[PDB]
Amino acid sequence: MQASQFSAQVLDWYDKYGRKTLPWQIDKTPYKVWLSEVMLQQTQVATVIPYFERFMARFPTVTDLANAPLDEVLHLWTGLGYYARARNLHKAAQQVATLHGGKFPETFEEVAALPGVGRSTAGAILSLSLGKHFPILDGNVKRVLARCYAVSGWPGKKEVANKLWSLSEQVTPAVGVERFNQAMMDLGAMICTRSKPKCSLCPLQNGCIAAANNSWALYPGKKP
Ligand code: SF4
């Protein structure tokens, strides 16, 4: 599928069916988007929402989080699992307070330099909170792109990852980047699921190679 067609069909779908009322989407800021992205990395949205609201009430700014004792952060994290995420969250808040005067940095390299924040999470923070023109590539996005364009191979292999990052850059637009990047996460989470994807509900079904061949189980590739 032509990349400009891909982007328009996804945005039209988002306009009518997309999620726009999660707490981190109202009055968005870099701090709220970063916090939600770290919580969502390994945890489902319904479990995260009460933790996100408790963290924003106790720590209204990144400086408040930075100045708090680590044990308090770990106590509030209890139940989210994967506590290396919380240790890195506190260190990244301290780096923003120390290097950036308590205001989130706005360049890709300074955001990716935060502990716990990789290439996709950095692009997510800058695109969703500030409109900057970066793509994302989490597991939801990998699945949609690898099925639509029939990208086989394991994404843990550098050459396969490079191909998926280039495809994501190509289909991600500048106008509407915040809507498109959330829409791709919504599609992978609710429609293009790991088992038995709901192709009849998908705005890419008219050009997707996996749908044409009933071959979604091949994409993305698994580890050998
Ligand atoms: S048509 Fe089916 S396999 Fe293709 S991107 Fe949509 S849900 Fe995934």
The CATH number for 141's domain is 1.10.1670.10
Method in brief: X-ray
Residue of the CA atom closest to atom 8 of ligand 1: 192
- 177 and 160, same domain (yes or no): yes
Question: Which residue, of 132, 151, 182, is where some domain finishes?
Answer: 132
- 39 and 117, same domain (yes or no): yes
What is the CB < 6 Å shell around ligand 1?
A: 144, 147-148, 191-192, 197-199, 202, 204-205, 208, 210-211, 216
Neighbours of 118 (CB within 10 A): 13
What are the backbone dihedrals phi and psi of residue 126, each rounded to the nearest 5 degrees, phi first?
-70, -40
- 31 and 109, same domain (yes or no): yes
Question: Which residue, of 132, 159, 182, is where some domain finishes?
Answer: 132
Report the number of distinct structural domains present in the chain. 2
- 31 and 123, same domain (yes or no): yes
Instruction: State which of 205, 206, 213, 215 you would mutate to test the pocket of ligand 1, scoring each by most atoms of that ligand within 8 A of its C-beta.
Output: 205
User: How far apart are the CA of 139 and the centre of ligand 1, in A?
Assistant: 14
Sign for the pseudo-dihedral over CA of 79, 129, 113, 42: positive
- 209 and 158, same domain (yes or no): yes
Atom of ligand 1 nearest to the CA of 209: 4
Q: Identify which of 30, 32, 139, 38 has the alpha carbon closest to the alpha carbon of residue 85.
A: 38
Question: Which residue, of 87, 108, 132, is where some domain finishes?
Answer: 132
CA separation for the pair 98, 100 (Å, rounded)? 6
Q: Identify which of 50, 52, 22, 20 has the alpha carbon closest to the alpha carbon of residue 36.
A: 52
CB 202 within 8 A of CB 147: no
Task: Give the per-residue SS3 of 133-194.
Answer: CCCCCCHHHHHHHHHHHCCCCCCCCHHHHHHHHHHHHHHCCCCCHHHHHHHHHHHHHHCCCC
Residue 28 belongs to what domain range? 21-132
The answer to whether 199 is annotated as binding is yes
- 70 and 143, same domain (yes or no): no
CA separation for the pair 186, 154 (Å, rounded)? 23
- 1 and 72, same domain (yes or no): no
- 47 and 111, same domain (yes or no): yes
In CATH, what number is assigned to the domain containing residue 82?
Answer: 1.10.340.30
The answer to whether 148 is annotated as binding is no
